[PDB]
Design a protein around this nucleic acid. Structure first.
Lengths: 109, 108
DNA sequence: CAACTGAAACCGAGAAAGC
DNA sequence: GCTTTCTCGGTTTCAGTTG
């Protein structure tokens, strides 16, 4: 019944999202860009796309029908990653204080 | 079932603020439906109603079970959804107001 | 309250339980 | 034969913080 595990694996594999990449050969640890909106280096097409893609996939946001609320899209994916036991953040590897910020996640088998 | 007559009694009783009839024929009613605060369920004006369903059905025994209001809410919500005796008038429900509530018609 | 956050409350739906 | 409750996998809100 779940969807997030296979969905996010597919997005990483797709190569459509520049910072979203595997960090080991085993495809069990990945990087996910995590840029604050409103900051000077924030590309709102490119840094919202994965979050928007999840809201589109799950039917929460419908292009042309619903009003975009990108911050809401981010909150959804963060909270889903937090609650899912298929994903656990490697907090000591995440880097949120630099110019290209990112989180690091491990996928539970 | 048990829920149909029980909820009618609760509305008729006047014991729960906001649990009230909307028409003379006593077929449409409002049930307050507020999101809880941080372990603050008193802002829910009908929080008593969720506890009452759990007691009536023996699901909560005072002094034995841990109070679990969030769970009490889900039981009544899910019971209403599946029940063929209560049917939500979604076009009348008001979840976005300061004293929010849902509206239900009772099926004959 | 602009964007952001963890914790918690919240949800529908189907499987399971219950009478 | 029918009526609620448990389980699940995320979602949204609370009450604050700038993660």
């Amino acid at each position: 019944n779940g969807k997030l595990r296979q969905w996010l694996i597919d997005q990483i594999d797709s190569g459509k999202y520049p910072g979203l990449v595997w960090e080991n050969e085993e495809k069990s640890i990945f990087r996910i860009p995590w840029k604050h909106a409103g900051r000077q280096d924030y590309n709102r097409e490119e840094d919202a796309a994965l979050f928007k893609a999840w809201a589109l996939f799950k039917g929460k946001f419908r292009e042309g029908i619903d009003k975009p609320d990108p911050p809401t899209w981010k909150t959804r994916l963060r909270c889903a990653l937090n609650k899912s036991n298929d994903f656990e953040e490697l907090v000591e590897r995440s880097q949120l204080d630099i110019s290209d910020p990112y989180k690091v996640y491990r996928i539970v088998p």
